[PDB]
């Protein structure tokens, strides 16, 4: 749908507020946060898969963050 086609940050200089700048943080996060609060059990499996995939803790953390981001986005 068109609602997912957010215009985004404008290209002008614009020392002012854009159309819906009050939602500049509400956007991009609200779907993810509601999905995570209403799917707490996915966090456990994402964390453990991130642990198992990553050779090192630096890779494990990145895997965990990426798994926690992708599933709420495409669900």
């Amino acid at each position: 749908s068109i609602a997912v086609q957010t215009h985004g940050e404008s290209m002008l200089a614009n020392k002012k507020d854009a159309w819906l700048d009050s939602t500049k943080a509400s956007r991009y996060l609200m779907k993810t946060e509601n999905w995570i609060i209403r799917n707490p059990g996915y966090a456990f499996v994402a964390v453990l898969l991130g642990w198992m995939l990553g050779s090192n803790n630096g890779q494990r953390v990145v895997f965990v963050v990426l798994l926690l981001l992708v599933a709420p986005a495409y669900s």
Binding site: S1, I2, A3, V4, Q5, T6, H7, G8, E9, S10, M11, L12, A13, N14, K15, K16, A18, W19, L20, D21, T23, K24, A25, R27, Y28, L29, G58, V62, V65
Partner: protein
């Protein structure tokens, strides 16, 4: 035309010309040695003759729905309304049997056609570069009171201000400034508003400056400027459960709110009859070789002054105040200065109202004086001897903190204006042009690799880049990753 009380202003120190970048709602104050102080700002920009490029339908209706049905193993149905342009037709299949009226059992093809009609459409128009029209205000500080400093009519009657039009046809003009002489500007309206990355989208009574790529990718039924036939109409239609003789088609609800949600980030503009907005930038060159001081031989005022309006802070490390003159001497220079202490009266700081003076000869004349004191304690002293009046003033910050603030302001100016940022407050030189060019190449390499990203994605990318660069090798890929991560995090935080 004037920037006093404006929350964001830039100070430029003057060498006969200086090139500035006038931003949307901002002003520049230029002080030059033995020159009147000037301020210049882009008041607005305009576009006059726009042409439609594309209409999108966001509220549509269905008029009459027909279904043509085929028995199983008889092939596709082909509703005969597929030959008419206004009908949207979809092929489905439904259960058929002896109860329905077929000689066989199984999936029989149907074809449903519904008459499409657009009720409400959003219209996107383009701007031709020759129709852009910038409004520019210039003001010589001169002698003003507090009640006429912002009044354009008074400042025009005093030949101390002028608002004019910058057009690609006439990109350079000169304003007469009475006894101050002439002030010239040569601008680049063509290099201002891009006009090729933008459309003006009108939805109802709301108008938005929007990116062309976003507008062309919008997932709504669309048409051509004068066309009445629509494409991708199935976006606004829902074909309900197939039925052997009557499949129902429902128009979706109005998408106006969904469109407004999608417009988040576009720049609102006013389009009563021409597009007007106050949000762009314009590179100009201010030429002031013909700008001269006025009243060079007035002589100092002799009577006593009084603070008509007490010294107030403007928020830009500057102080404004308003004096009243008891004397009727005539046009005379005001003996006002900033001193470190009331002993050792040597002047410090810098007047922003250069050469303040009393304009008329009648008494009780009020003069607005605005100056920049140094950090710490200082005294505003006007008069000498028994008529001297003093005001104690304190400036809170420090030189190093101001340097850091200027550094971050310049960084965010680079983030906003991109390459024109090097054109800001420059006088040329091998440094600025080389720096500008390397900024151009790095900006291309940065926009082709990380453009089209929101603040969250670029913040996470910067975090990843910092992590990898800290853990990297070769000390050369690591520097690149550190730089990109830092820039990405700065950009992510710069919108908050």
């Amino acid at each position: 035309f004037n920037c006093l009380g404006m929350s964001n202003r830039d100070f430029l120190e003057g060498a006969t010309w200086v090139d500035v970048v006038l931003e949307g709602d901002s002003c520049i104050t230029i002080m030059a040695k033995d020159k009147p102080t000037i301020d210049i700002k882009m008041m607005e920009t305009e576009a006059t003759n726009l042409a439609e490029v594309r209409s999108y339908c966001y509220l549509a209706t269905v008029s009459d729905v027909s279904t043509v049905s085929n028995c199983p193993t008889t092939g596709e149905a082909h509703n005969p309304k597929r030959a008419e342009d206004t009908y949207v037709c979809k092929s489905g299949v439904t259960d058929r049997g002896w109860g329905n009226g077929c000689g066989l059992f199984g999936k029989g093809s149907i074809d449903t056609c519904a008459n499409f009609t657009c009720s409400l459409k959003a219209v996107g128009r383009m701007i031709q570069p020759e129709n852009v029209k910038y409004e520019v205000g210039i003001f010589i500080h001169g002698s003003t009171s507090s009640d006429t400093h912002g009044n354009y009519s008074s400042q025009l009657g005093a030949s101390q201000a002028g608002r004019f039009t910058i057009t690609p046809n006439s990109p350079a003009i000169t304003v007469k400034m009475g006894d101050y002489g002439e002030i010239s500007v040569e601008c680049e309206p063509r290099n201002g508003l891009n006009t090729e990355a933008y459309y003006i989208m009108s939805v109802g009574t709301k108008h938005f400056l929007v990116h062309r790529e976003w507008f062309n990718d919008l997932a709504l039924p669309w048409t051509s400027p004068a066309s009445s036939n629509w494409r991708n109409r199935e976006i606004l239609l829902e074909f309900e459960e197939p039925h052997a003789t009557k499949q129902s088609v429902v128009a979706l609800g109005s998408q106006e709110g969904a469109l407004h949600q999608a417009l988040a980030g576009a720049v609102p503009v006013s389009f009563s009859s021409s597009v007007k907005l106050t949000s762009g930038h314009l590179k100009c060159r201010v030429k002031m070789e013909k700008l001269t001081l006025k009243g060079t031989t007035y002589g100092m005022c002799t009577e006593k002054f009084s603070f008509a309006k007490n010294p107030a802070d403007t928020g830009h490390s500057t102080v404004v105040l308003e004096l009243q003159y008891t004397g009727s001497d005539g046009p005379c220079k005001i003996p006002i200065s900033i001193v470190a202490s009331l002993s050792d009266l040597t002047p410090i700081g810098r007047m922003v109202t250069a050469n303040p003076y009393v304009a008329s000869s009648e008494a009780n004349a009020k003069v607005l004086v605005e100056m920049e004191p140094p950090f710490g304690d200082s005294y505003i002293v006007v008069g000498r001897g028994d008529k001297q009046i003093n005001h104690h003033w304190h400036k809170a910050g420090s030189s190093i903190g101001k340097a850091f603030i200027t550094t971050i302001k310049g960084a965010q100016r680079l983030a906003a204006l991109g390459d024109p940022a090097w054109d800001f407050g420059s006088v040329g030189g091998i440094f600025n042009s080389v720096g500008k060019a390397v900024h151009q190449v790095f900006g291309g390499a940065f926009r082709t690799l990380f453009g089209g990203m929101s603040w969250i994605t670029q913040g996470l990318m910067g975090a990843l880049l910092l992590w990898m660069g800290v853990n990297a090798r070769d000390r050369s890929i690591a520097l690149v990753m550190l730089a990109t991560g830092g820039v990405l995090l700065f950009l992510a935080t710069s919108v908050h």
